[PDB]
Amino acid sequence: VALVYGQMNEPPGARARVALTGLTVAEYFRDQEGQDVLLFIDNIFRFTQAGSEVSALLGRIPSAVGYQPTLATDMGTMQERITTTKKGSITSVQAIYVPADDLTDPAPATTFAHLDATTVLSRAIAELGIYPAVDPLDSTSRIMDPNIVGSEHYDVARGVQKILQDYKSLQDIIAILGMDELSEEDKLTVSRARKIQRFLSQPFQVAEVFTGHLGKLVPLKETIKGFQQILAGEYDHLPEQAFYMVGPIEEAVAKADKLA
Amino acid sequence: VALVYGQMNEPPGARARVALTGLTVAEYFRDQEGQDVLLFIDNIFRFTQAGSEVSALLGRIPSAVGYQPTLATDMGTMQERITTTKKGSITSVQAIYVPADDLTDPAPATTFAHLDATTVLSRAIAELGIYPAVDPLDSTSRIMDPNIVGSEHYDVARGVQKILQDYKSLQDIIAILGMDELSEEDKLTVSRARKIQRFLSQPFQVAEVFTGHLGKLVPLKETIKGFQQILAGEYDHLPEQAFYMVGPIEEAVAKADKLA
Amino acid sequence: VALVYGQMNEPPGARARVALTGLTVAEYFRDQEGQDVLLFIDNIFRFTQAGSEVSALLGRIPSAVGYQPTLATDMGTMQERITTTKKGSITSVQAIYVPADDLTDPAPATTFAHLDATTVLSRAIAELGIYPAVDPLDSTSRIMDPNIVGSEHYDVARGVQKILQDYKSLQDIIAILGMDELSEEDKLTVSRARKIQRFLSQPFQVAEVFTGHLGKLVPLKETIKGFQQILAGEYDHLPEQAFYMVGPIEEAVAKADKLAE
Amino acid sequence: ATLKDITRRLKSIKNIQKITKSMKMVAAAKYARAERELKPARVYLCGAIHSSVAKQMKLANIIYYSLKESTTSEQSARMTAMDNASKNASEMIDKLTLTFNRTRQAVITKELIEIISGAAAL
Amino acid sequence: TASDAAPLQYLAPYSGCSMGEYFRDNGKHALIIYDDLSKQAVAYRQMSLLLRRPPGREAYPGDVFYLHSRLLERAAKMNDAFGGGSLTALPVIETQAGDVSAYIPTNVISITDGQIFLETELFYKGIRPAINVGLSVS
Amino acid sequence: TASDAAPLQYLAPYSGCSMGEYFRDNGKHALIIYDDLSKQAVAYRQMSLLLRRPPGREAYPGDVFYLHSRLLERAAKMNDAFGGGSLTALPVIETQAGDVSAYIPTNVISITDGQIFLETELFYKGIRPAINVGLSVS
Amino acid sequence: TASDAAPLQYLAPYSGCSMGEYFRDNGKHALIIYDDLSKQAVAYRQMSLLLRRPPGREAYPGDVFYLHSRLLERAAKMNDAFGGGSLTALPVIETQAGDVSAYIPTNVISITDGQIFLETELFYKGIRPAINVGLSVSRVGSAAQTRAMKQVAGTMKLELAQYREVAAFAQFGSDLDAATQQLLSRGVRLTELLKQGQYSPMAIEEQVAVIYAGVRGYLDKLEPSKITKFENAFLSHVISQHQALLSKIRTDGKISEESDAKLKEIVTNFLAGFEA
């Protein structure tokens, strides 16, 4: 990683440009060495704000909500340099701050014009111990189209979510009226869902110096199969905790063994 | 009929003056021939908008909402020629486009004071399927005087408004909890109000292609009457749907049979 | 009493200065005589509106809400003279207008910091016929300290405020969902609150032309006690109306009988 | 509409929605108990309950019957009813929030336009 | 009226006031209705912006309060030393969406000796006059 | 696109329209798709605020309705004496939170000859095209 | 103050910052309170507009964010290589009608490591200090708590978050299960333990002793109305009689299994005493 910094004490113009500087660097590992670089802009809102400060200083009339008249171009001239050219591609993970919790606020609204996916980190999920604490129902992607990820991928994914949704429904019932008017059917959606929820968690190699556990980098193929089978009913006999913090389904099997 | 046009494709100045032009034509028949004129304008809001388009160019500090500081006087010296006099009569019907649906907008807001009768159309009502989408508690007429329409008319009129006003206040509660908790008495206003609301709608020849029904023209006494009875509880047995999209009350009874 | 006047029929200029003249007269008795002064200003907002009225003609870019950019400092160099010193004492009572009823308006908003006690009046309370229309949950005093007024004074006050707050929160809800489902524990606070809400009104001696009631002045102990008892459940039997427009708690008891028929 | 007005309703419809939601979980509970106790007895804001009987209104062995039944039906009724009440309160909390943010935004632009308008006339 | 120049509409109230003071200053009694002070403010706003005076709150001159205070202070009761005559004023102001807290509405409510607030809700409901007891004062 | 100067984004629809007009003008039939008029509107507003024109509702300049009426008036069906040709415009407008009352959406609804409103609810619930059959019109 | 020219009100926070830097740099620790950053922003806005610089939202100059960031960044923890000295800053921002998103409140929130949110509703409801525990934050977190505190802070934080989920139900809880009915009880007692009078800051050892009391469940059968009285007297007692246990807790920095047992008895006998 190369780190580029635009600290909060820097004047508008500096916090304004540092995301371009970082961009410059990344474009090299693509236009000069044709790799697949990763660009991280933390956070995309302070980019826009820096834009407004600069704008105001240049005495230009602000537009709706006080932002810059050039909000959309200031953003476009930067966002657009982030793509897959014939030489390689830059992929950007942008930390978003939504003002006033207003998703139609000009800053945020403009920004979504460019996003192809959202990764929603959730404190609730974390509380399940589940990590990465990504929310499987709130996180989204433009490319989750069978015409793009292929029917299999697309169906598994849509399978995982529905089950996760259904279970969500039952969640209310379980706690109140108690876990049993539950059908041979309603008891399976839960079981699997709970297995799934866990199978969606995973050990990171970045946290090895700490979790005393070995990191896993599951492959896409392994991912779709994994969930495919749980949906399928291939491991309904396996127990929940067999799936907590593992990589490929094979590990779910072996953990079960060590868990008698 | 004489036709004058300065449409949506003209530069601002043309739109700013065609009203004056149609207006002049009408003034000739009124004063030079003591004729009884009919003057239709669609849309007089456009004249004011046109004014706002050139106003900055004339170099004026804008007034509220970016409109020209001369908005009222411009409406005034123009609106004041659209009038009946001792020489001739001008019945004028003017369509007034309300921007963003905001009736507090300087344009429409400043126009109320020039009319004798106003028909305020509502998106909310239209969306319920009631056409014409007239707001019954927001339309008025300086003729709604017992000494002009007769007390029979004056009492049905105020009768209908009172019940719709009453229904209107119950709506907040109806909205979270529905009708269950409502008083037997309150539920009767609600029934009657919903039947009066439907009986206010009607098929226009001009809108036959959309209502799917034959246009109707109801004679005043038929209106005064049909509304009396409804008020008077003479149809508390019929279903609401019987009243929707009909002319005279007699057709509402029939529709009820057909609904069986 | 000396009087100084620069009313609403005056040009902005006069209005931007009378307070100064008034305040100047008062500072004399404070310093040159060393006396205990009582300063009444009605209404200090006018000093600030005066300034905003000429501001544009002074060639200034407007700050927010139309105010002049020097509002706070203009207010500061003035408010800082209206004060008690070691030489003399000033007890200033300033009326403060609230434009559009919005307490966040730059003017009313900027003045809170200059006060040791604030009485916030509300059209929502007034509208109910409760005079004086003070808002019990938006009024404050720097001496509302157990170390200064005592714990009986303090526990009652806070006791009265908790219940009015408790009732404020329920208001919007029993509005729709009604009152049956409420716990007898909670329909008693609705009771007591509604009675306190009334016991807080009072017929002023300067508003008989308004209330049609003889003005009552209640002594601090008659107040503390009256509320203490309502809070204690000692009048859950009398009707709310008995507590409306009365002085001391005994008048609420008498009024109950008179109402008893 | 006033942000302060909208924040009152929102403040309160948010509560009504949680109350209402809580009342259903209760209504479901009692109704669980009831469908069981009901079993045996036949071998012998509550929806439109009290009214349905009220309109059409104008021993022991059977007293416990009409009772043991009229409670399953009631706890059934309150349940669904409060289920839709929060369903309604939710459509509103989502509806009012949008009115709140349109206004919130609108108020800020309106002010700035006023300032800019005055600055520009000097 | 509506087609009269802004400055006529603006002046109109002061003009009419002066005709009422004649009676007030001569031990006679006068009553003046300013119908309405809303349209005058607009006229003032227009006249004023066209003079290039920087717009203020809501686009009106920073002195619209003053515009009406100056006028309505003139309605008054003179002592016997001055004829005992008087001038009573009934100014009209138009609210929008029954919002009386509005800046202009309160500007004028803070000058007069009370208000009569009429609500459309009450009016439709049958309560005519639509006087709102609670919000009106003298 | 997103990276071209606002003036080019602003211009784009007029150019495409002229190209569609050749066909309309020669007894032929063209179809023009403006995607989206939402973003053209913000491009034009950026231009207008930078030129310093008074910002109005939503900071949009007073003539944004005309930015659109002029454009969409050009779609049209000529008669035989003029070729019988035609131009059909399917302009796109992006609403925020299904709010079809906003300034821009309303503007555009008051220009075209019907709308096709797609609903997010419908879309997730699996109804696609997410058309709202009661609200939409022709 | 109020009558001092704008520029002095503007400067004040920097000139106070420098003063605190002398300590920071010299291996010493310094605390700085800016009361308020709202008024200084106003002072700055006033000069900006009078010098005719361009006005942005709320009439604030484009460099108002930079005025505070360059101020609040001068606070920091140095490295031993530099003296290990520090500068902590407690900046105050006055919101309006709780609009934490207004301009200046947005900047400063965005610059600092956490916020202590106070609320009127809470204040008048009896929670004083009015800290809204759900929205308050400390990016630094436990990296700054003592092991003693953590030993307790941690479960308290958690039952509270849990109460906050159910709290609203209380007032209409016509029939809640004893599971959640439990969290409402822990909820109101833990909340009463967070209450506090002014001018009487406590020693970390006194805070954990009291927190332990409700967190462990000892005040669960006690009346909400009495927790304030309990703590007061309970704490008076151990500050009197038990200064050796507190000295332990203090020293050992945590609650040993022993001192744990000693506290159990101290509270179970005091409580008994208490409800006699």
- The backbone torsions φ and ψ at residue B138, rounded to the nearest 5 degrees and listed phi first, read -125, -10
F54 contacts on B by Cβ (under 8 Å) = 56, 62, 66
Q: Where are the extended beta strands (E) located within C116-216?
A: 117-118, 140-141
F99 contacts on D by Cβ (under 8 Å) = 98, 102
- The backbone torsions φ and ψ at residue G53, rounded to the nearest 5 degrees and listed phi first, read -70, 160
Q: If DSSP codes are grouped into helix, strand and coil, which group holds residue F130? A: coil
Closest CA to A136 of A173, A172, A165: A165
D106 and chain A: CB distance < 8 Å anywhere? no
What is each CA distance from B108 to B46, B71, B103, B115, C58, in whole angstroms? Answer: 11, 11, 6, 11, 35
The Cα C87–Cα E114 span in angstroms is 43
Structure tokens belonging to residue G193: 């333990």
The Cα F95–Cα F76 span in angstroms is 26
Supply the DSSP string of G41-95, one letter for each residue: HHHHHHHHHHTTPPB-GGG-BTTHHHHHHHHHTS--B--GGGTS-EEEEEE----
The Cα B199–Cα B193 span in angstroms is 10
Our CA-based measurement puts residue A76 at a distance from the nearest CA of chain F, in whole angstroms, of 5
The Cα E79–Cα E85 span in angstroms is 8
Q: Are A227 and A156 in contact (CB under 8 A)?
A: yes
Cβ–Cβ of F1/A80 closer than 8 Å? yes
The Cα B226–Cα E86 span in angstroms is 54
The Cα D75–Cα G86 span in angstroms is 63
What is each CA distance from G85 to D122, G26, G29, G30, G90, in whole angstroms? Answer: 52, 6, 5, 8, 17
For B68, which residue in chain D has the nearest alpha carbon?
D117
The Cα F54–Cα D119 span in angstroms is 12
The Cα B242–Cα B247 span in angstroms is 11
Q: Are A89 and A33 in contact (CB under 8 A)?
A: no
G139 is catalytic: yes
Q: Are D76 and D38 in contact (CB under 8 A)?
A: no
Burial class of residue F44 in the structure, from the number of CB atoms within 10 Å of its CB (0-12 exposed, 13-18 middle, 19+ buried): buried
Q: Are A71 and F43 in contact (CB under 8 A)?
A: no
| Residue C132, preceding peptide bond in cis (omega within 30° of 0) | yes
- Those residues whose C-beta lies under 8 Å from the C-beta of residue C28, and which sit 6 or more positions away, are none
The one-letter amino acid at G130: A
Q: Nearest by CB to D109, which of F52, F59, F99? A: F59
Question: In 3-state terms, chain F is what percent helix, strand and coil (to 5)?
Answer: 45, 10, 45
Q: D-E interface: how many C-beta pairs under 8 angstroms?
A: 17
Burial class of residue G121 in the structure, from the number of CB atoms within 10 Å of its CB (0-12 exposed, 13-18 middle, 19+ buried): middle
How many Cβ atoms are within 10 Å of C78's Cβ, its own excluded?
Answer: 18
Burial class of residue C200 in the structure, from the number of CB atoms within 10 Å of its CB (0-12 exposed, 13-18 middle, 19+ buried): buried
Q: Where are the extended beta strands (E) located within B123-249?
A: 140-141
Q: If DSSP codes are grouped into helix, strand and coil, which group holds residue B36? A: strand
How many Cβ atoms are within 10 Å of G122's Cβ, its own excluded?
Answer: 17
The Cα A78–Cα A82 span in angstroms is 8
C133 and chain G: CB distance < 8 Å anywhere? no
D113 and chain G: CB distance < 8 Å anywhere? no
Cβ–Cβ of C178/B181 closer than 8 Å? yes
Q: Where are the extended beta strands (E) located within chain A?
A: 36-42, 89-95, 117-118, 140-141
Torsion of CA B205, B210, B213, B217, to 10 degrees: -30
Q: Are D8 and D16 in contact (CB under 8 A)?
A: no
Q: Are G72 and G91 in contact (CB under 8 A)?
A: yes
Chain E: partners with 3+ C-beta pairs within 8 Å: B, C, D
Determination technique for this entry: X-ray
Q: Are B161 and E124 in contact (CB under 8 A)?
A: yes
Structure tokens belonging to residue D5: 């007005």
The Cα A56–Cα A73 span in angstroms is 16
Torsion of CA F42, F47, F48, F51, to 10 degrees: 160
Cβ–Cβ of C61/G97 closer than 8 Å? no
G55 and chain D: CB distance < 8 Å anywhere? yes
Q: Are G113 and G140 in contact (CB under 8 A)?
A: yes
B176 contacts on C by Cβ (under 8 Å) = 176
Structure tokens belonging to residue A109: 């609204």
Among the listed residues G45, G57, G70, G139, the single catalytic one is: G139
Task: Report chain B's terminal Cα–Cα distance, integer Å.
Answer: 47
Structure tokens belonging to residue E2: 């509506």
- The backbone torsions φ and ψ at residue B10, rounded to the nearest 5 degrees and listed phi first, read -85, 160
Tell me the longest C-alpha to C-alpha distance in chain D: 92
Q: Are B26 and B88 in contact (CB under 8 A)?
A: no
Angle at B228 between CA B224 and CA B230, to 5 degrees: 125
| HEC string for chain D | CCHHHHHHHHHHHHHHHHHHHHHHHHHHHHHHHHHHHHHHHHCCCCCCHHHHHHHHCCCHHHHHHHHHHHCHHHHHHHHHHHHHHHHHHHHHHHHHHHHHHHHHHHHHHHHHHHHHHHHHCC
Q: Are C122 and C128 in contact (CB under 8 A)?
A: no
Q: Are C61 and C44 in contact (CB under 8 A)?
A: no
Cβ–Cβ of G97/D4 closer than 8 Å? yes
For A57, which residue in chain G has the nearest alpha carbon?
G62
The Cα B34–Cα B40 span in angstroms is 19
The Cα A141–Cα D121 span in angstroms is 49
The one-letter amino acid at C31: D
Angle at G191 between CA G186 and CA G194, to 5 degrees: 130
Chains F and B touch (3+ CB pairs under 8 A): yes
Entry field: residues in chain G: 276
Question: In 3-state terms, chain B is what percent helix, strand and coil (to 5)?
Answer: 55, 10, 40
Tokens 């001092």 found at: G4
D81 and chain B: CB distance < 8 Å anywhere? yes
The Cα G6–Cα G46 span in angstroms is 7
The Cα B39–Cα B192 span in angstroms is 38
Looking up residue G190, the CATH number of its domain turns out to be 1.20.150.20
Structure tokens belonging to residue B112: 């109320």
- Those residues whose C-beta lies under 8 Å from the C-beta of residue E33, and which sit 6 or more positions away, are E89, E90, E91, E92
Q: If DSSP codes are grouped into helix, strand and coil, which group holds residue B144? A: coil
Helix G147-166 vs helix G204-215: crossing angle, to nearest 10: 40
Q: Are G166 and G183 in contact (CB under 8 A)?
A: yes
The Cα C86–Cα C92 span in angstroms is 16
Beta bridge partners of E91: E34
B155 contacts on E by Cβ (under 8 Å) = none
Q: Are A201 and A245 in contact (CB under 8 A)?
A: yes
Domain around B199: 144-260
Cβ–Cβ of D89/B66 closer than 8 Å? no
G174 and chain D: CB distance < 8 Å anywhere? yes
The one-letter amino acid at C100: A
What is each CA distance from C33 to C1, C2, C22, F19, in whole angstroms? Answer: 15, 15, 16, 91
Structure tokens belonging to residue C119: 């009485």
Supply the DSSP string of E12-66, one letter for each residue: HHHHHHHHHHHHHHTT-EEEEEES-HHHHHHHHHHHHHTTTPPP-GGGS-TTHHH
The one-letter amino acid at C86: K
How many Cβ atoms are within 10 Å of F29's Cβ, its own excluded?
Answer: 14
Q: Are E122 and E130 in contact (CB under 8 A)?
A: yes
Structure tokens belonging to residue B5: 């046009």
- F36 assigned binding-site residue: no
Closest CA to B87 of B37, B35, B38: B35
Sign of the Cα torsion F28, F31, F37, F40 reads negative
The Cα B251–Cα B245 span in angstroms is 10
| Residue F36, preceding peptide bond in cis (omega within 30° of 0) | yes
The Cα A239–Cα A191 span in angstroms is 9
What is each CA distance from F124 to A116, A156, F118, G156, in whole angstroms? Answer: 18, 17, 11, 40
F56-68: b or e for each residue (b if 16 or more CB lie within 10 Å)? bbbbbbbbbbbbb
Task: Report chain G's terminal Cα–Cα distance, integer Å.
Answer: 54
Beta bridge partners of E29: E86
Tokens 């793509």 found at: A83
Torsion of CA G31, G34, G35, G36, to 10 degrees: -150
Structure tokens belonging to residue E26: 């001569």
- Those residues whose C-beta lies under 8 Å from the C-beta of residue C179, and which sit 6 or more positions away, are C187, C190
The Cα B152–Cα B227 span in angstroms is 11
The one-letter amino acid at B202: Q
Tell me the longest C-alpha to C-alpha distance in chain B: 68
Task: Report chain A's terminal Cα–Cα distance, integer Å.
Answer: 43
D40 and chain E: CB distance < 8 Å anywhere? no
F111 contacts on B by Cβ (under 8 Å) = 8
Q: Nearest by CB to A53, which of G55, G63, G73? A: G63
D118 contacts on E by Cβ (under 8 Å) = 54-56
Chain D: partners with 3+ C-beta pairs within 8 Å: A, B, C, E, F, G
The Cα A146–Cα A150 span in angstroms is 4
Chain A: partners with 3+ C-beta pairs within 8 Å: D, F, G
Cβ–Cβ of F73/B123 closer than 8 Å? no
The Cα E61–Cα G192 span in angstroms is 53
Phi-psi group of C37: left, alpha or beta (phi > 0 → left; psi -120 to 50 → alpha; rest → beta): beta
Structure tokens belonging to residue C197: 């809400």
Looking up residue B174, the CATH number of its domain turns out to be 1.10.1140.10
Domain around G155: 146-276
Closest CA to C82 of C53, C48, C44, C45: C44
For B66, which residue in chain D has the nearest alpha carbon?
D113
DSSP state of F137: B
C174-189: b or e for each residue (b if 16 or more CB lie within 10 Å)? bebbeeebbeeebeeb
Mutation target among C172, C173, C177, C181 for the B interface, most CBs of B within 10 A: C177
The Cα A31–Cα A83 span in angstroms is 11
Tokens 């029904």 found at: B213
DSSP state of B31: I
Tokens 């050796």 found at: G244
CB pairs under 8 A, 24+ apart, for C207-211?
C207/C131, C210/C131, C211/C131, C211/C245
Cβ–Cβ of D12/C175 closer than 8 Å? yes
Q: Are E85 and E23 in contact (CB under 8 A)?
A: yes
Q: If DSSP codes are grouped into helix, strand and coil, which group holds residue C110? A: helix
Q: Are A104 and D101 in contact (CB under 8 A)?
A: yes
CA C178 to chain centre: 32
What is each CA distance from A206 to A129, A217, C195, in whole angstroms? Answer: 17, 11, 64
Our CA-based measurement puts residue F39 at a distance from the nearest CA of chain A, in whole angstroms, of 9
Tokens 């002010």 found at: D111
Closest CA to B120 of B128, B130, B132, B129: B132
E7 and chain B: CB distance < 8 Å anywhere? no
E55 and chain D: CB distance < 8 Å anywhere? yes
Q: Are A239 and A210 in contact (CB under 8 A)?
A: no
Burial class of residue B182 in the structure, from the number of CB atoms within 10 Å of its CB (0-12 exposed, 13-18 middle, 19+ buried): middle
Structure tokens belonging to residue F136: 């939409």
Supply the DSSP string of A102-169, one letter for each residue: -TTSHHHHHHHTT-SEE--B-HHHHHTT-SS-B-TTT-EETT--HHHH-HHHHHHHHHHHHHHHHHHH
Closest CA to A34 of A79, A90, A93: A90
The Cα B79–Cα D60 span in angstroms is 81
Q: Nearest by CB to B52, which of F62, F73, F74? A: F62
- Those residues whose C-beta lies under 8 Å from the C-beta of residue A237, and which sit 6 or more positions away, are none
What is each CA distance from A258 to A32, A131, A229, A250, C48, in whole angstroms? Answer: 50, 22, 21, 13, 79
Q: If DSSP codes are grouped into helix, strand and coil, which group holds residue A7? A: coil
D29 contacts on A by Cβ (under 8 Å) = 176-177
The one-letter amino acid at G173: G
Burial class of residue A41 in the structure, from the number of CB atoms within 10 Å of its CB (0-12 exposed, 13-18 middle, 19+ buried): buried
The Cα E33–Cα E14 span in angstroms is 12
Q: Nearest by CB to D113, which of F55, F97, F99? A: F55
The Cα A46–Cα A96 span in angstroms is 9
DSSP state of A207: G
Structure tokens belonging to residue F132: 């709202």
- Those residues whose C-beta lies under 8 Å from the C-beta of residue B149, and which sit 6 or more positions away, are B143, B157
